[PDB]
Design a protein around this ligand. Structure first.
Ligand SMILES: Nc1nc2c(ncn2[C@@H]2O[C@H](COP(=O)(O)OP(=O)(O)NP(=O)(O)O)[C@@H](O)[C@H]2O)c(=O)[nH]1
Ligand SMILES: Nc1nc2c(ncn2[C@@H]2O[C@H](COP(=O)(O)OP(=O)(O)NP(=O)(O)O)[C@@H](O)[C@H]2O)c(=O)[nH]1
Ligand SMILES: Nc1nc2c(ncn2[C@@H]2O[C@H](COP(=O)(O)OP(=O)(O)NP(=O)(O)O)[C@@H](O)[C@H]2O)c(=O)[nH]1
Ligand SMILES: Nc1nc2c(ncn2[C@@H]2O[C@H](COP(=O)(O)OP(=O)(O)O)[C@@H](O)[C@H]2O)c(=O)[nH]1
Ligand SMILES: Nc1nc2c(ncn2[C@@H]2O[C@H](COP(=O)(O)OP(=O)(O)O)[C@@H](O)[C@H]2O)c(=O)[nH]1
Ligand SMILES: [Mg+2]
Ligand SMILES: [Mg+2]
Ligand SMILES: [Mg+2]
Lengths: 284, 336, 290, 290, 290, 285
C-alpha cells in the first residue's frame, strides 16, 4: 500500500468486490503492474506473505483442459489420469478451509477461456461453491467422485487489453467475472513520489506526465481502433533505476527508442510520420 | 460521360444478393462505400459471434484426447515414446468463410485509391484475427461455399467479398490494387439490372407471383427435334397474376442516357417470347420494356400485334425511396 | 420434496413451470434457452426433485459440457486402466444402468452449457434412441464398440433429460434441426417484473418506490435490446442475477448499492453491446442512475 | 407378415412403397432423404419384414453413424485384449457371414443418419462391393487387415442396405458423387395431404374442419419454406411427427393442443429458421393459432 | 481370352482401348480418370485377362484405397500377435513374389479409389521402384523394416499397375503430385453417343427414336455441366451406367423406366449440383421427362 | 573481436546494455548478416572469457516441441524413461554457477510455435519472474518434490530473419518478452573496409563496391510493401573466400555476383528478369 502507484480507492473497491464476488478480472494495457498488484493483493487478503497459498500461471493459445484440471498423461509404466494444478490446488485449500488460497491467470485473453475451464465455468460462481453443486468431471471414471470449488478459493484474472481477438465473445463468463479497469497512473503522486524520492528533478517529472498523457489521449481519441485499453503503462520507468542512476533526460531517451517505439509502430502501423512526431515530441 | 451516383448501385446490389446509413461517409466512389459496409459488417458479426466449425484433428500427442486411433498408433509404434494418434475436435474460426474475410481485408488495404480512415480501420481488424490464416482467393473458393451452411448475415458480406476480388485490378504498383471502373461496362451493369429486378419483384409484389420462365419455340423441324441451333430463350422475368400476365425485358444501354435515335434492339427478342408463350389461363398477355435513364422517367403504351406493350424509363440518380415508389407505381399501371 | 419448497425463492412464474412439467412428462427431453443469470442452473436441480417428487440426488446427475468432451467419455470408449486399456462405460451409460434397476422412479440427467460441445458427435447413437416413442428394448441398438450385434443399448422410459443453453452466443447454437426436434424448447425470461422477485427485495428492507423504479428501468432496457433483433435478439437481454446475490450480509438495497454494481458489471457490458455508440452507452447508464 | 399389416398406420402413400421395392430389389442399396419427422426410422423397421416376408429381427441389423464411426468399427479393426491387442471382426463383416449362411432368406443392414460420417472412410473396401452387380465370389476381395493367407470378403447377393439421411443439415450432405451412384435416393414428403394421415386423426376424435384447417396452414408454410433455396430449401419443410404423438391417453386434438405445439416446439424452430425479422415469425405463429 | 467376348459388350470405342493397351505395355503405370458410372472398374477387370490372354485369377489382383490403407498393410509391416509383433509381407510384396517366379507372364495390380489415400503414405519408398525405368534387380533396395540390408525388394518389370480415379470431388483439383509423374492419365468419356451403347439398348427391345432422343439430352446436359469449371468441371459429368442397370428382367426401355431413374438418381444429384439455382433443376428435370 | 565485427560498435555496446537488464533479446535482420557469428562473439563478449561450453545454440523448426526442448519420454531398450532436454539440462548446469553468465541461442525462432515448445516456462523466462521464488512443477514432473526454475544468470538471444515476405506480423507472444533490434548489413562501416584493405584491396574497388551495394540496398528498400528494409542484402557473402588465400579482385566479385546475389535477386523480385539483368549488369560494371 506504500510503493503501489494505483489509487487506494481502486484497491479499496477491489477488496470489497473480490471478497463479495470472489472472481475478478484486472484489465489494462501492459506495463501497469497487473502482476505486482495481484501478488501484493493476495498477501493483503491473506494478511501474511505466504507464497505456498498463491500460485500464478500464464495462459497461452495451446493451453488446454488437459493441462489445467484433469488429463491423461504418461508415467514411466504407461498412461494414467493426472490431476491438473487447479484440481491439485483446490485440494490444497480444501485441506485447510480457514485460510484464503489464490489462483492467478495471466494472458487470459489469448486462450479460449471456456475450453480450459469447462466444468468450473459454472462452479466458479460464489454461490455455487460446495458439495451440493459438485459434478463428475469429464475423465472421472465414476459419477460418484466429483469436484466442487471451495468457498475460500478466490480467482484473479489479468488481461491484456491491447490485443483484442474478434473470434469469440462470451458474455456469460463476463457474468462470472467482475471487471475492473486499471489506468496507467502517471498523474498519481505515488508514482511521482517514488521518482521524487529517487532524486528526480521536479520539472522533469511534471513535464514527463504532460508528455505521456498527450500521447495517451491521442490513443484514446479513436475509440473503435484503439482505446484506454491500448494506452501506455508506467512500469518501464520503475525498473532500471534501482541500480543508482538518477533520473535524467538521457535515461528517458534510452527507453523511448528501446521500448516505446515498436509499440508505437505496432499501434501506429504504416504511419512512420506519426511515429517520428510522437517519438520526437517526447525527447524535447 | 454521365453515370449513376455510386451509392444507388449498392441498393440494387443488395437485392441482387438478396440481403444502414450511407450518408455519413464522404467518399462518393464505390470502394469507399463498399469497404465501409464490410468494415462495419465484420464488427457487427463479432458482437453476435463469428462462425466456429468443429474441425476434427488427428495428430500425435503425449496422451489421450478424444478417440485414439489404434491402428496408426501401433503401426508407428508411438506408444513407446509415450504418444498416441488420436482424433479430436479443436474449435477454430479458421473456416473457409472466415479466411475469405481476412484475405479480402488484405486486398482492401492494398487498394491504392481508398479513404485513409477506411484503410486505417481495416488494418486493425487484420491484426485482431490472429488465428485465421491468409489465403489467395479464387472463385473456386467461393464455389465450395455455395452449400450455404452459414448464417444469413454471413452470405451478405461474402457476396461483397465476391464483388471486390473480381472487380480488383493491379494499378501503379505490383503489390497494391486498383478498383475496376464497373459503371462504364454495360454488360455487367446490365446483368445487375436484370437480376436486380428479379429478386426485387419477389419482395414488393406480394400480390403477383414472380418467376423466371423458360420458353420453347413453337417450331418443328424435320432435321432435328432438338433444335439446338435455335437460340436458347429464357425470360428475364415473368410476373404473373390471376388477372394479367406480364413479361419484362430490361437492359442498360448508353445511347438512351443521351436525351435522337433510340436503342431498342431488345424489343426484337420480346415478341417471340410473347409468341412462343401460350397461356392456359388465357386472361391476357402483356409486355414491358424498362430501361434506366438519369434525368427523368417517361412511360408509353402500345398496341402492336394484338399485344399491349409499354416502353418506360426510370430516373436513376433521383433518390432511392422515390425510385422504390416509382417502381411500384410502374408495375401498378401495367399489371392491371 | 414438495412443490412449494421451490416456489418460495423462484422468480419464474408457475405457469411456465407448469408448462415445463407437462412437456417433460410427455417429451422427456427439453432445452431451456435464455440469457445467463436467470437460474437455469438454479431451477434444474430443483425441478428434478419436483418431477421425482422426492429429494433424491443419487438419481440425479449434473454435468457441464465443453469442447473437450466426447462419446468416449460420455457413453462408451476405450481408456487406460494402466498397462492395459479397457472399454470404459461412460457416465451416461452408467446412469442408464442405474435407472434400469428402478423403472418406477424417474432418473434425470442435467447438462449445463450443452450448446458448446458437438452434440452430434457426443450423443451419436443416443440421438435416435432418446425419442419418447422409441425408448425400450424394441429399439435397442448395438454400439460402436460393442463386441457383437447382440449387445445392445436402449434408453429407459423413466429417463428425463434437461438441457441448459444460453442464447447470448449465436456462434454456438443448436443448429442441427433434427436434434432440435428431439428437444422441446422452453424459453425463459429474466422475469424482473414479477411479484416474487420484488417480494424478495422488499423482504430485504427495500423501498417499494426504488424497487418498482428498478423493474421499470430494465423492462424498458430489455425491450430496447430486443428491438434490434438483427444485432441483438431477446436472448442477449440482461438477467436478474446481478441484483439477486450480494445482499446476504443484510445490506439494504440503497441507490448507492445499485450505483456500485452498475459501474462494475453492467457498464462494461453496455460498452460491448454498443461498441459503435458511445453516446448510447452514456444514455442508458446515466438513465438508470438518474 | 404382409403389406396390409405394415401400411395400416403409415401416412406415406403406397406409391412410394412400391417404388422402394422396385428400386430396392433391382439395385439393393437405397437412401430415403427427408426432413425429420416423416417416419424415416419408422418405415425402415417395417420394410425389413416385408422383403423377408416374416417378422424376424435376426435377419435385420440397425445402426446409427455418429461422425466417429470407423473402418475399425464397421469391418475390421484392432482391439485391446487383456494384455495385448487383437484383430476384431467388425459388425458388418460379422453380419455378412451370417447372411451368406443362407442365400434364400434376405438380410438387411440399416444405417440411420448415414450422411454424417465420412462414408469413404467407413466403408473403405466395401464401397465398390455393395453394388448389385459386383456381388458374390466373382468379386471376392482381400481386406486391409486380412491375414497374409488369402482370405476374401464379398458382399452376399441376399443383402440389402437402407440408409436414412436427413436433408436439413446442408453441410452434412453426400458429396461423394462416386458413392451417390451406388445408392438410389427416394424423396419422402411431409405426409400432410394424405387422407391416411387425416383418418388417423379423425379416428382419434378430430374434427374434419379442424383437421382440414391444420393441413391447409402447414402446406402454406412449407410452400413459403420450399420457395427459398438460399438457406431454407425444399428439404427443410416441417414433418408431421410433432402432431402424431402424445394423444394416446385420450387427449383429443384441439386448438389448445395445437397451441401448445406451436408455442413450444415449432415457434422456437421458426425463429431459428428465419432469424432475420420477427414479424415473419409473428405472422406464421399467429396464423397457426387463428 | 478372345477380344470379341470382351470388347463387344463394352460401350467404349475400340480406338481408346487400343491406346490404353499401348501405353500400358510401354509404361506399365496407367490411370483411368473419369466420372463414376463409365465402367472404369468394369474395363479394368477385362483388360487384365486381355493382356494375359487367359482367364486366370492368380495373375491379377484388385484392391481399393482408403484413408486407413497404409504402407504397413500394403507392402510390409508388423502385426501384433497375442503380445509380440511379427513382421508380415504385404499384398504388393506378396503379389510381386508370385510375379517374380513367372517373369514372362504378365501380372496386373488393380487399385480403385486411389486418390483417397496419399500414395506416399502407402507406397512410400516404392515410388522409386514403381516407375517404369527404375525396375529390376539393378535398382533393388532394402526395405524400411528389413532385418538386414541384404534382403531387398525390386518391382519386376512384368507387373503393370492400373489406378482408377474419379474426377467428382473438389479436393482432386489439387491432384497428388505422385500420380502425375509416375502414372499416365487417360480420360474416359461418358460415351452416350456410341453405337454400341445404343445397339445394346435396341437389342433389349427398345425403340430407336426413344433411344436417340435420350442421347441428345444426355449429350446436351453434360455439355451444360462441362461448360462450367468453377463448380462442376468436365470430369463431373454424368456416366452411362444408370441406364445399363435394371434391364435383366427384360423390361423394355420407356419413359416409365426412365422416369424412375431420373427421379431417384439424377434429380437429387442435380439438386446438389445446381443448389444455387433451383429453377435450373426444374428446367432440366422437365426436359428429361419429355 | 570488436574490430573484427563489421557492425557499429555503438550497436555492439547497445545490445549488452539491453540484454543485461532485459535478459531476453532477439536479433532480426537479413540473411547473410552473420547473425550466428555475431551472437557467438557477443556471447563470448559478455562472458569475456571466450568459453564455448557456457554458450549453447539451437535451431528451431515447426516439428520442434516441448519434448525435444525441455523434457519428454523416450523408449528404452524396453519401455520408456523420462529424458531430460536441452534447456532443462542447460539451466541446471548454470544453476551450479550463479555468477557465471550462461547463454542460449535460438535460431529460426519464428518458424516454430513458442507456446507449444516452451509451455509452462514461457512466463519463467520473462526477467521479472526468475529464481527459486518462481518455481513451477513441470508437465511431466509427476512428483512435487522438485521444480524447474531458470536462474537469473541465463541470457536468451534469438536469431530471427526478415528475409521472407511470407512472414506476417510476428507472434504476439514474442513481442512482449523480447526486445527487437534491427541490424544493418554494415557495408558503410570502416570495419568492413578495413577487412578488405588488410587484404590489399584497391580503395577504388573498396569504395565502388560499397557504393555499389548501398545503391542497390536503397532501391530494394525503396519498395514499401513487398521488399522492405529487412530484405536488403547482407555482407556475409563477401567475407567467405578472401582470407582463405585468394586476394580480392573484380573477378572474385563477379563469381560472387553470380553465386548468391544473382539468384537471390530473382527470389526477391521474381517478376521482371530485365530488372534483374539491369541490376546484375550494374553490379558487374
Ligand atoms: N435466490 C435466488 N437466486 C436465483 C434465482 N434465480 C436465479 N438465481 C441466481 O442467479 C445465479 C445463476 O443461476 P444460473 O442458473 O446459473 O444462471 P444461468 O442462466 O444458468 N447462468 P449461465 O447460463 O451463465 O450458466 C445464481 O446466483 C442463482 O442463485 C432465484 O429465483 N432465487
Ligand atoms: N403412427 C404413425 N407415426 C408416424 C408415421 N410417420 C412418422 N411417424 C412418427 O413420427 C415419429 C418419428 O419418426 P421417425 O422415423 O423417427 O422420423 P425420422 O426421419 O427417422 N426422424 P429423424 O430424421 O429425426 O431421425 C415417430 O413417432 C413415428 O412413429 C406414421 O405414418 N404413422
Ligand atoms: N454391359 C456394360 N456395362 C457397363 C459398361 N460400362 C459400364 N457398365 C456397367 O456400369 C456399372 C458400373 O461400372 P463401374 O466400372 O463400376 O464404374 P466406376 O468408374 O468403377 N464407378 P466409380 O467411379 O464410382 O468407382 C457396372 O454394371 C458396369 O458393368 C459397358 O460398356 N457395358
Ligand atoms: N512500486 C511499484 N512497482 C510497480 C508498480 N507497478 C508495476 N510495478 C513494477 O513494474 C515491474 C513490472 O510489472 P508487470 O507486472 O510486468 O507489468 P504488467 O504485467 O503489464 O502490469 C514490477 O517490478 C512491478 O512490481 C507500482 O505501482 N508500484
Ligand atoms: N570474420 C568475420 N566473419 C563474419 C563477420 N560477419 C559475418 N561473418 C561471416 O559470415 C558467415 C555467417 O553468415 P550468416 O549470415 O550467419 O549465414 P546464415 O545464417 O546462413 O545467414 C561466416 O563466415 C561469418 O564468419 C565478421 O564480422 N567477421
Ligand atoms: Mg448457469
Ligand atoms: Mg429418425
Ligand atoms: Mg468403381
Amino acid at each position: 500500500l506504500n510503493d503501489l502507484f494505483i489509487p487506494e480507492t481502486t484497491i479499496e473497491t477491489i477488496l470489497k468486490r473480490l471478497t463479495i464476488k470472489k472472481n475478478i478480472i484486472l484489465q489494462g494495457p501492459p506495463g501497469v503492474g497487473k502482476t505486482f498488484v495481484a501478488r501484493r493483493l493476495a498477501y493483503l487478503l491473506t494478511g501474511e506473505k505466504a507464497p505456498q497459498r498463491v500460485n500464478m500461471v500464464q495462459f497461452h493459445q495451446s493451453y488446454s483442459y488437459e493441462d489445467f484440471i484433469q488429463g491423461y498423461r504418461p508415467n514411466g509404466v504407461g498412461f494414467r489420469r493426472k490431476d491438473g494444478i487447479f484440481y491439485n490446488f483446490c485440494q490444497q485449500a480444501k485441506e485447510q478451509p480457514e485460510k484464503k488460497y489464490i489462483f492467478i491467470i495471466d494472458e487470459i485473453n489469448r486462450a479460449n477461456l471456456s475450453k480450459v475451464f469447462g466444468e468450473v465455468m459454472m462452479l466458479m460462481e460464489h454461490d455455487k461453491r460446495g458439495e451440493n453443486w459438485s459434478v463428475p468431471l469429464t475423465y472421472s471414471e465414476n459419477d460418484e467422485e466429483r469436484f466442487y470449488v471451495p468457498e475460500n478459493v478466490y480467482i484473479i484474472g489479468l488481461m491484456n487489453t491491447a490485443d483484442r481477438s474478434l473470434a469469440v465473445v462470451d458474455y456469460a463468463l463476463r457474468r462470472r467475472f467482475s471487471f475492473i479497469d486499471i489506468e496507467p497512473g502517471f498523474d498519481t503522486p505515488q508514482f511521482r513520489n517514488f521518482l521524487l524520492n529517487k532524486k528526480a528533478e521536479p520539472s522533469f517529472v511534471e513535464s514527463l506526465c504532460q508528455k505521456m498523457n498527450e500521447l495517451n489521449q491521442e490513443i484514446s481519441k479513436e475509440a473503435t481502433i484503439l482505446g484506454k485499453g491500448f494506452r501506455i503503462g508506467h512500469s518501464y520507468f520503475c525498473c532500471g533505476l534501482e541500480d543508482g542512476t538518477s533520473p535524467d533526460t538521457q535515461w528517458l531517451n534510452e527507453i523511448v527508442m528501446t521500448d516505446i517505439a515498436p509499440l508505437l509502430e505496432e499501434y501506429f502501423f504504416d504511419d512512420p510520420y506519426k511515429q517520428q512526431k510522437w517519438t520526437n515530441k517526447l525527447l524535447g | 460521360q454521365p453515370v449513376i451516383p455510386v451509392r444507388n448501385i449498392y441498393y440494387m446490389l443488395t437485392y441482387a444478393w438478396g440481403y444502414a446509413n450511407l450518408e455519413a461517409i464522404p467518399g462518393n466512389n464505390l470502394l469507399d462505400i463498399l469497404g465501409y459496409v464490410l468494415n462495419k459488417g465484420v464488427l457487427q458479426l463479432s458482437r453476435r459471434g463469428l462462425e466456429l466449425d468443429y474441425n476434427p484433428n488427428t495428430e500425435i500427442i503425449p496422451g489421450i484426447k478424444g478417440r485414439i486411433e489404434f491402428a496408426k498408433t501401433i503401426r508407428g509404434f508411438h506408444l513407446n515414446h509415450g504418444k498416441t494418434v488420436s482424433t479430436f475436435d479443436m474449435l477454430n474460426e479458421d473456416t473457409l468463410a472466415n479466411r475469405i474475410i481476412k484475405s479480402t481485408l488484405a486486398i482492401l488495404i492494398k487498394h491504392e485509391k481508398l479513404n485513409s480512415t477506411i484503410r486505417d480501420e481495416a488494418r486493425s481488424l487484420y491484426r485482431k484475427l490472429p488465428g485465421i490464416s491468409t489465403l489467395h482467393l479464387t472463385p473456386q473458393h467461393f464455389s465450395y461455399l455455395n452449400g450455404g451452411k452459414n448464417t444469413r448475415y454471413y452470405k451478405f458480406v461474402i457476396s461483397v467479398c465476391k464483388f471486390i476480388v473480381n472487380n480488383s485490378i493491379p494499378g501503379q504498383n505490383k503489390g497494391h490494387y486498383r478498383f475496376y471502373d464497373f459503371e462504364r461496362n454495360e454488360k455487367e451493369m446490365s446483368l445487375l439490372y436484370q437480376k436486380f429486378l428479379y429478386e426485387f419483384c419477389r419482395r414488393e409484389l406480394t400480390s403477383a407471383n414472380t418467376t423466371r420462365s423458360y420458353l420453347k419455340w413453337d417450331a418443328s423441324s424435320i432435321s432435328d427435334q432438338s433444335l439446338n441451333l435455335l437460340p436458347r430463350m429464357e425470360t428475364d422475368i415473368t410476373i404473373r397474376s390471376s388477372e394479367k400476365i406480364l413479361i419484362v425485358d430490361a437492359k442498360y444501354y448508353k445511347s438512351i442516357f443521351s436525351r435522337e435515335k433510340f436503342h431498342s434492339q431488345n424489343l426484337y427478342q420480346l415478341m417471340n417470347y410473347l409468341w412462343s408463350l401460350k397461356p392456359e389461363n388465357g386472361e391476357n398477355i402483356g409486355g414491358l420494356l424498362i430501361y434506366p435513364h438519369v434525368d427523368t422517367a417517361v412511360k408509353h403504351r402500345y398496341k402492336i400485334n394484338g399485344f399491349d406493350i409499354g416502353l418506360c424509363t426510370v430516373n436513376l440518380g433521383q433518390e432511392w425511396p422515390c425510385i422504390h415508389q416509382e417502381l411500384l407505381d410502374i408495375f401498378d399501371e401495367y399489371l392491371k
